[PDB]
Amino acid sequence: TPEMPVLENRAAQGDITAPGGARRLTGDQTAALRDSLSDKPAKNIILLIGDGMGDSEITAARNYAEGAGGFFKGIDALPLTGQYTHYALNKKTGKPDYVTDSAASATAWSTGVKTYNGALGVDIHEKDHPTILEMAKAAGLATGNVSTAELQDATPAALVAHVTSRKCYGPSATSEKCPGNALEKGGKGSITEQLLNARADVTLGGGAKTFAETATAGEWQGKTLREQAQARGYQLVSDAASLNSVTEANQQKPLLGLFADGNMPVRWLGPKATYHGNIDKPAVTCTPNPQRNDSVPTLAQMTDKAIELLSKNEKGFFLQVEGASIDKQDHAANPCGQIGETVDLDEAVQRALEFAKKEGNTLVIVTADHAHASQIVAPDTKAPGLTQALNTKDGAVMVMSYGNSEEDSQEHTGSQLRIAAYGPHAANVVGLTDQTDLFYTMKAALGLK
Amino acid sequence: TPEMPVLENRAAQGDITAPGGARRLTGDQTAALRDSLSDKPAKNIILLIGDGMGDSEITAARNYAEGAGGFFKGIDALPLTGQYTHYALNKKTGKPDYVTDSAASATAWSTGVKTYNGALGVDIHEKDHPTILEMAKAAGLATGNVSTAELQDATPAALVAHVTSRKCYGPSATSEKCPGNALEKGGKGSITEQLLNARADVTLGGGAKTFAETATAGEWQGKTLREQAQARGYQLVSDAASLNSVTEANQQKPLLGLFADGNMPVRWLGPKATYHGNIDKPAVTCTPNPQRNDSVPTLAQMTDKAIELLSKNEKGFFLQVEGASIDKQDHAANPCGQIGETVDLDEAVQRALEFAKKEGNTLVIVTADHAHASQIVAPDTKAPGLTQALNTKDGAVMVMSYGNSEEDSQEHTGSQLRIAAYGPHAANVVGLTDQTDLFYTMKAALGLK
Numbered sequence A, B: 001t002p003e004m005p006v007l008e009n010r011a012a013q014g015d016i017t018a019p020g021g022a023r024r025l026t027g028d029q030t031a032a033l034r035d036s037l038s039d040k041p042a043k044n045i046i047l048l049i050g051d052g053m054g055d056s057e058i059t060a061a062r063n064y065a066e067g068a069g070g071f072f073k074g075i076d077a078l079p080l081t082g083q084y085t086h087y088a089l090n091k092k093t094g095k096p097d098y099v100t101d102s103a104a105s106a107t108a109w110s111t112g113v114k115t116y117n118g119a120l121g122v123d124i125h126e127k128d129h130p131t132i133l134e135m136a137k138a139a140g141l142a143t144g145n146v147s148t149a150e151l152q153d154a155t156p157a158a159l160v161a162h163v164t165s166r167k168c169y170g171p172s173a174t175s176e177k178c179p180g181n182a183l184e185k186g187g188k189g190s191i192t193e194q195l196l197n198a199r200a201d202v203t204l205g206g207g208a209k210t211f212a213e214t215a216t217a218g219e220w221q222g223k224t225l226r227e228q229a230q231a232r233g234y235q236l237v238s239d240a241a242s243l244n245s246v247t248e249a250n251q252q253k254p255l256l257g258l259f260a261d262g263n264m265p266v267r268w269l270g271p272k273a274t275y276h277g278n279i280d281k282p283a284v285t286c287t288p289n290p291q292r293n294d295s296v297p298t299l300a301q302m303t304d305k306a307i308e309l310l311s312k313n314e315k316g317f318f319l320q321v322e323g324a325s326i327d328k329q330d331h332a333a334n335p336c337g338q339i340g341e342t343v344d345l346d347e348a349v350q351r352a353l354e355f356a357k358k359e360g361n362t363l364v365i366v367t368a369d370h371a372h373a374s375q376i377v378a379p380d381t382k383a384p385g386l387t388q389a390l391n392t393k394d395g396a397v398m399v400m401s402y403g404n405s406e407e408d409s410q411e412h413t414g415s416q417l418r419i420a421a422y423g424p425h426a427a428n429v430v431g432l433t434d435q436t437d438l439f440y441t442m443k444a445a446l447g448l449k
């Protein structure tokens, strides 16, 4: 009984060359919007983040994969939409810093406080602030954290770790870069160590490499972090079959899935964009990555499994799911990698909305941490940066441009970007808001004090 | 009573470095949104166009003028928001052309049909389609067209002209460029001649220059376009006091304001962005244009005058206002020019909202024709294009980058972009829609046959 409707189909309704054929609506939307408005409490929240997934990135992927007049059945399906700002702060002056990194932005939605680029779960004065995940857990809710990146990376770590630098993955880097957080120095520990303490019910991702380090002090001194997790009662899975086999995940038997040494493999392969690549080279067609896997769970699969597991908690659950490599491939000026990760996120959003429609008390949110480099430009463009032409689903060429850095990595950009939601309290993402308003919306939605 | 609320305050609530200080929301928005929803008929429609104003331009402008946690009283105040697609079509194949120009996009919203770049009020078959302005006229409503560009420019031209190329300003160019539209060949004539025939009640903008041209055929043969105009009943005006003098505008005494030979002068000046300008050159503070003028009305002024005059019509009115030079200065890689024109549009939108709040049956819409080049990047960015550092209201530096063309004009981009509305039927802009839906929406709100 989907009391609240999702947008079933907003693809062009007919022939795009004819009058009205490019319409995405079939009639007035007033009543459907009224029906999408509920202030009832949310039992559950599922927060879906496409890292670096700005409006440009969603547009490019739609054009490629679905066609210009196409529709992402997940991404584009959320009825309430708005734009949000994600500015960070300068540590020294406390003034705005126009372009955030993933650590400052994730800290923002996860704690409700602005911070400096590279900070995790701390403010500009380096004070710790409780995260939305720690709060939910303390309230009795089940908690899940899923990402295709290494688990120590910014987006997932922000929910469980409070360190002065996102670089402090394990004991060795923490000692050098976050001496104040170093276990041996009386601190709370490296990101990985804090993650082990946070003890969410379900944690699935990459980053097995760091689990090989040994703790420098404490109860588990001299053992590996992997050993520590086993000693601590975590159930460890490392492949798709092992994950599927899991029937329970909780405080007694928390699940920890480590599917790659670093980040999980990307869905699609293609060449890097190059200088005048749209003039000098032929059009590219993306191709599935063979290293992707049947033993490797996809984001949608990880999403479905977490939901099954966490759904067993009568009080409710909090789940964050990250499509991490949209950003990584945007930095890499690799259209196909970038777009393939966005189609990947869309499958995950579809799974989340099916559950939510069914359940009726679930708030689903789809947004990004910050904007990115990629731009859609005309085919005959002569640009200073890196470009590539692509053969889209329409049978037409689309060119993408990366022109904001002469360095090896293309840059994040500062533009406000799309926020979309479905479910109870969804109205709170409409209009202009701030990334910190999202923490407060989630908190109030679940009724946390 | 203001049955329909606008957003009175979406600025940062307090101290941005403290928990919750950067929030824009004070509490739950459910109720406010509900109250923002109505399906009754609109009596009037005010469409505000920021040419090339994507989310990036809006952000950069807010940051500079109001600060990161600031808020635009006009632009940011519309409660219902979405994202729309504006792709055009390739003329030969009927396939999508990912990056539109200003003529194809204005055609879509003004006629409800997609078209090829450079086309005005015609489909890919070069077949004419009625515009929303012609339709309102036919139903007895008052109609107004205001812009800061030359009135023959694409944006305002699309409501009153049907030509195969937007370059067909007047007889000269038309005979050459759009032979089939040339008066002498049986055509409906050039943009300017067709503008004279469309006969809107209120037409304010630039482009006096083409009016010096003389007709090659027709009843007004051998006379200039201006003479034909006065000759036709037109009340012509060329300055602010003269514009202020006007007490009425109607089919009997239509108003034609020509405040400039070419485009109206921009509000702010600053240096053009340069290669490595953010590293090699000091931060910029924008300078008001001392040659802008007390004799030239501002957009807000033309806007206030147009509403007053058109409101005298009991049946209602349709008004299009264009903040045209946002796009032009974005092409020129001129941050200050670009920002000043957005702040300029904000004032106009503020006037439209005041009226609409008071009037009660007015649908106000704010959006752009397509995306643009400007990007906000980190201060220390080393980019291959044109960059500039600016000193913002926050007292911090923001750097803008233009990196999609090696030619002398930066390019439009294809990204979906913000659409926002207030008033009856505004729900119709929420979520994902296409530019052609805007026509259908407007036509339906007004009940045009």
Ligand SMILES: [Zn+2]
Pocket: A051, A052, A101, A102, A327, A369, A370
């Ligand atoms: Zn990121």
Ligand SMILES: [Zn+2]
Pocket: A051, A102, A149, A153, A154, A155, A156, A322, A324, A327
């Ligand atoms: Zn991330």
Ligand SMILES: [Zn+2]
Pocket: A052, A102, A327, A328, A331, A412
């Ligand atoms: Zn990044």
Ligand SMILES: [Zn+2]
Pocket: B051, B052, B101, B102, B327, B369, B370
């Ligand atoms: Zn334009």
Ligand SMILES: [Zn+2]
Pocket: B051, B102, B149, B153, B154, B155, B156, B322, B324, B327
């Ligand atoms: Zn224009």
Ligand SMILES: [Zn+2]
Pocket: B052, B102, B327, B328, B331, B412
């Ligand atoms: Zn332009």
